[PDB]
Structures are given as structure tokens and as C-alpha cells.
Amino acid sequence: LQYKKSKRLQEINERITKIKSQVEPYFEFITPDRWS
Amino acid sequence: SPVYDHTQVVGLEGDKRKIKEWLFRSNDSQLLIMAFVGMGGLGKTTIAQEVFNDKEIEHRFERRIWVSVSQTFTEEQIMRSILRNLGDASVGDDIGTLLR
Amino acid sequence: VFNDKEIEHRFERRIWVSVSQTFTEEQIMRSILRNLGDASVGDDIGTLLR
Numbered sequence A: 001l002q003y004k005k006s007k008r009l010q011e012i013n014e015r016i017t018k019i020k021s022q023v024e025p026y027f028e029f030i031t032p033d034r035w036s
Numbered sequence B: 001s002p003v004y005d006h007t008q009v010v011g012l013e014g015d016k017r018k019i020k021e022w023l024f025r026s027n028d029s030q031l032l033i034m035a036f037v038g039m040g041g042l043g044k045t046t047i048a049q050e051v052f053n054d055k056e057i058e059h060r061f062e063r064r065i066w067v068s069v070s071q072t073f074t075e076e077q078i079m080r081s082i083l084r085n086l087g088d089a090s091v092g093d094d095i096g097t098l099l100r
Numbered sequence C: 001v002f003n004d005k006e007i008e009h010r011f012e013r014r015i016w017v018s019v020s021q022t023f024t025e026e027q028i029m030r031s032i033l034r035n036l037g038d039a040s041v042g043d044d045i046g047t048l049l050r
Ligand SMILES: Nc1ncnc2c1ncn2[C@H]1C[C@H](O)[C@@H](COP(=O)(O)OP(=O)(O)OP(=O)(O)O)O1
Pocket: B008, B009, B010, B011, B012, B038, B039, B040, B041, B042, B043, B044, B045, B046, B047
């Protein structure tokens, strides 16, 4: 079946998108040698 | 900076005396280094200003040099500030030439 | 006042300094230097008072 692999794809896609969404506002908040 | 008033400076003649007799023993080492350690706003910069704006010290040392270092700093600005205090022109220049 | 002539005989080195809302210390210092007659030298603050 494609069922088990489709739900594996679902879980890993949703974890990627969730991590992006909750990381992004922290970057929205702040903005930012060797010699001899 | 070494510019102050020396009229509000409430008596520091003992500390000034002791540090002057430390500086008269400069040749007895190879390079005498001294430390003024204390909490914030206690008198460290002003006791240093009271030291090397005296006259015996100015006869002793040819080229007295003040250098301000802060929280925020970089190496090459310290280097060229030493150059300015010596008498070299403030030349836009890089670090390896400065120590030479 | 200080474009009169008696005042210009009185004072050797009259100095105008513009300070505004927006300012910084070292530009005031080097503007005093320019008004005195020193060269506008790229330089830091502790040397300026000396
Ligand atoms: N003996 C003194 N008589 C009069 N004023 C003094 C005396 N000692 C210190 N002051 C004044 C000078 C300054 O206005 C203020 C801060 O002292 P200062 O020497 O600049 O601090 P400090 O060198 O002890 O520490 P820091 O540089 O970290 O602030 O105290």
C-alpha cells in the first residue's frame, strides 16, 4: 500500500514546516581579524 | 584622557607618593608593569591622572602615553592611538606596519 | 556681539561652535580644533583635549 509511506511523508513534512514556522520569528526579532 | 582639574581632587598624597616611589624604581626591572585594581568609580583613572601629570615624572619619562581601552575596542585603533600619542601622523594604515 | 571690533581686539581666538539636537562629542571637539587653527586630522577623543 501507499498508505504507510504517505503518512510517513505527512509526519516528516509537517515537522519540517512546524520547525520553520516556530524558528522564523526569532530571526524576525533581532537584526545583527588575524594578522602577523 | 589625561585632562582633569586637580582642585576637586581630595587628598591622594599618600597613594601618589607610593606610586611615585614605585616609578622611580623603573630601571631595576626590565619592564615595570603596575595595576590599579578596584570597583567602578573608585579613583583609578584619577589616581593615574594625578600620577603622571606631576613634574618629576615628566622629567623622568620622555614620552608618556595615555591609551583609552573600553568594553568595545579593536586592536588597530589601540595601535594607532599609541602612534598618535608618540607623534607619528595619523596615517590610514594596516596592523603589521604599526608594530614595526 | 562678537563681530564687533572692540571684542575682536580683546579676544585673540574667538570660536563659534554649532551644537544641535543631534550631535556627538568628538565632532564638537574637532570643530573647536578647526576654529583654533589645527588641521582637521582624523583622530580620537583623548588626544583632542590634550
Ligand atoms: N580623590 C578624589 N577626589 C575627587 N574626585 C574624585 C576622587 N576620586 C575619584 N573622583 C571622581 C572623579 C570622577 O568624577 C569619579 C569617578 O572616578 P574615576 O577615577 O573616573 O573612576 P575609576 O577609575 O575608579 O573607575 P572606572 O574608570 O572604572 O569608572 O570620581
